[PDB]
Amino acid sequence: MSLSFCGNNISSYNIYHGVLQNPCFVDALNLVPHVFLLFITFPILFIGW
Amino acid sequence: RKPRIRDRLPKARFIAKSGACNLAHKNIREQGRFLQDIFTTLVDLKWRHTLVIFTMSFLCSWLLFAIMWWLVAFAHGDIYAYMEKGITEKSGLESAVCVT
Amino acid sequence: RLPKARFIAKSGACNLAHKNIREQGRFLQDIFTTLVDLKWRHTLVIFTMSFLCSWLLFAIMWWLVAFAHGDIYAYMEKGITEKSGLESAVCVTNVRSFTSAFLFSIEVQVTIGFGGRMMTEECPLAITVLILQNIVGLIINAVMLGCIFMKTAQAHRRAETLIFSRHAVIAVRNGKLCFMFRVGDLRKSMIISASVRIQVVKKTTTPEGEVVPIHQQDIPVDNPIESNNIFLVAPLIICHVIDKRSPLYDISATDLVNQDLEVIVILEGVVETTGITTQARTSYIAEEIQWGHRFVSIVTEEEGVYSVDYSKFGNTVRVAAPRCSARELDEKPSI
Amino acid sequence: ITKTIKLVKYWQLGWGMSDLRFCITGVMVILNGLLMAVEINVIRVRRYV
Ligand SMILES: Nc1ncnc2c1ncn2[C@@H]1O[C@H](COP(=O)(O)OP(=O)(O)OP(=O)(O)O)[C@@H](O)[C@H]1O
Ligand SMILES: *[C@H]1O[C@H](CO)[C@@H](O[C@@H]2O[C@H](CO)[C@@H](O)[C@H](O)[C@H]2NC(C)=O)[C@H](O)[C@H]1NC(C)=O
């Protein structure tokens, strides 16, 4: 029942065969840049100049 | 005082009875608002806003570096090594789970 | 060629030499004072470098300690599974390589302390190193917290931003010669208990044959009760009546050009926003005083509230004023 | 940069010439590029050293 970041099918996160050549890692890295933007933006726009 | 009624604007009030300097500066050489200015606004906040910025900052830092750690424990082939339920954790010892 | 240097540079910052001064040396108190007064772009570097160097040095010491007792030597030669290694006198459980010792440091000083790396009571050297590491960590942490807070505390103030007019005007007022300059403000908080002073500095002799190359001769700012204090919220014109008792009596526009002289204007007050004393200065040289150019009004009359401007700060309209002396000014008042 | 990596991977697989998911990604890349352009232009246009 656990939520799956990369889907729950077993061992579908078997990241052999190249570090970044996996069907899921690309999405995650793209999400990392988006999360970074939101966090920095919220902290500098919750005060204002 | 209808003349004064229409003269409500025409009035020699250099400083308002409150005390402020009711004036108007213009045509000045505003160089900008350099970064450090924002930090000064951080000092002169009120308690509700200071508490909010405090807690929000701590939580944002925690979540951000947690996301980073999540990626790290992903790339090292760690989450998969744990997900292998052949045993309670069959080959999870030698694979050097990057973060235990 | 090079004109004799102004006892005060235009922006301030008295530029005078200082030769044959006996050295006062230096003190480490001074290094600390230099540390506190840094700017961010170097504080957030010296701070980080202190931390990283601290961790690395103590990790090296830890590695040596785990070397002497042979912690590494026992660990590496391990049999299948584990019978020989765990039970013997290891000094720091589960340190077996540099990176491991590094992690042990970073877990000890910064107070993380996970638990995979436990320390036993069998190696006095280990106890002394732990004590020393912890004390060093506390001292470094305290001083860096102090520095960061001092910046967060005394950054309520900024660079001195006070603006004098560019030029000076010798004008006519109340049927007499007069001296005028403009003093304004761009800051927010009105200066509290401000004061203004004017000093003429020129080489003088003394009839008993003695010279004093840069005299200073305070001179009276005009005011209806002679009070050096001055309120300022809009640009002002700090005047100066001229009389035969004032040191400017002997100058006309003809003799102004090639004349050795100066005026230094220094005004001081305590800004209330930062609660701190401050003083600003200017200095006008002979060639910088446009004669006769009476000042141009600034304050207007907008409907509800008065208004001022700053683009036309030094606009000098010109009017007729006598081109003659001041002694001769009262010698011949006929027409 | 994340999108470019995603597109090359989206590349090698060659699921389709126009397989829809490849089509979208491409669109997102170009707008991103246009935004990069504006940032550079704004640097020059306003105060830049
Ligand atoms: N509108 C204004 N905004 C900012 N500063 C001003 C303004 N008007 C005057 N000043 C200050 O007064 C001083 C004398 O200014 P003045 O009216 O002579 O302009 P300027 O010196 O001829 O031209 P600039 O100010 O560009 O050098 C200047 O150092 C300036 O800092
Ligand atoms: C998890 O399960 C899926 C199936 O739901 C697997 O993918 C396919 O499964 C078949 C066997 O039924 C295998 O041959 C291949 O792995 C896939 N189909 C092929 C190539 O015929 C796979 O084990 C996991 N999911 C993925 C990534 O396909």
Side-chain angles (χ1 to χ4, degrees), chain A residues 7 9 18 23 28 33 43 48, chain B residues 3 10 12 16 19-20 24 32 66 73 75 77 81 86 92 96, chain C residues 3 5 9 12-13 17 25 59 66 68 70 74 79 85 89 101 113 115-116 124 126 137 142 146 153 155 159 168 171 175 184 194 207 209 213 220 224 234-235 247 253 269 275 280 286 292 304 314 320-322 326 333, chain D residues 14 16 26 33 37:
Chain A
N9 170 352

